[PDB]
Amino acid sequence: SGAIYVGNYRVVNRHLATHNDWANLVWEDSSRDLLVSSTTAQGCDTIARCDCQTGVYYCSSRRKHYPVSFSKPSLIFVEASEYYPARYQSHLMLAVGHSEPGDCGGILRCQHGVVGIVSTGGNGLVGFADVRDLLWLDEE
Numbered sequence: 001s002g003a004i005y006v007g008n009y010r011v012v013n014r015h016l017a018t019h020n021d022w023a024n025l026v027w028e029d030s031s032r033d034l035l036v037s038s039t040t041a042q043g044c045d046t047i048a049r050c051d052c053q054t055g056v057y058y059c060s061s062r063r064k065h066y067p068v069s070f071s072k073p074s075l076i077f078v079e080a081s082e083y084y085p086a087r088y089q090s091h092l093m094l095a096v097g098h099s100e101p102g103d104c105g106g107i108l109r110c111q112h113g114v115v116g117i118v119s120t121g122g123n124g125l126v127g128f129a130d131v132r133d134l135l136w137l138d139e140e
């Protein structure tokens with residue numbers, strides 16, 4: 001579990017998005033594992049506008065923050081899971097790190113603010129759904 005709260009927006013893994021999230025759907029990309037919903041509250045999170053390839057992600061399955069090198073957002077193939085089929089996920093960044101299914105929504109972040117949320121995992125890798133190209137999160 002984990003959500004980015006910026007402006008009047010809640011960002012989630014789409015595979016963990018609630019009936020409420022869908023009722024107030026702003027934008028969804030099945031291929032990015034990303035949903036964004038409208039909120040009534042403003043958010044205090046800031047979205048990194050940068051091309052950092054080093055960050056800190058929260059691993060709930062370790063209750064630890066891990067510094068990581070990560071790849072540039074790409075169209076990468078993702079193996080079978082349980083919350084998804086074996087599929088191609090876009091705007092996805094891989095780092096060598098621990099990621100279980102329940103670590104999804106773990107925030108990845110650099111000095112510039114939030115970079116992404118944990119989306120994929122296993123084979124000793126962690127996949128993050130990039131959100132830094134979504135410029136529209138930073139107004140209204």
Ligand SMILES: Oc1cnc(-c2ccccc2)nc1
Binds near residue numbers: 018022023
């Ligand atoms: O996977 C589910 C997520 N959301 C909904 C949903 C249905 C009607 C209105 C709002 C939400 N259903 C199923």
Ligand SMILES: [Zn+2]
Binds near residue numbers: 049052110112
């Ligand atoms: Zn950055």
